[PDB]
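Quick check before the chapter quiz. The format below is the same one you will see on the exam, so make sure you can read both the input and the output lines.
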Amino acid sequence: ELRCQCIKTYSKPFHPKFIKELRVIESGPHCANTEIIVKLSDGRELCLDPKENWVQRVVEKFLKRAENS
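Here is the expected output.
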């Protein structure tokens, strides 16, 4: 069981295209709260907090449209 990889998420907002890899983690017994995860192209790793409207909007601005997943 892998608990939330980020005890403290990103509260400050930031532009999404900088993120080179935006992958979110689902919730379960390991962690009831959902946790987002991104990897800035500069070589940084910051988990986002879905409590804000910018983190959920940033995820849609990056994962917008539906392809096949």
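If your answer matched, good. DSSP finds one helix and three strands in the chain.
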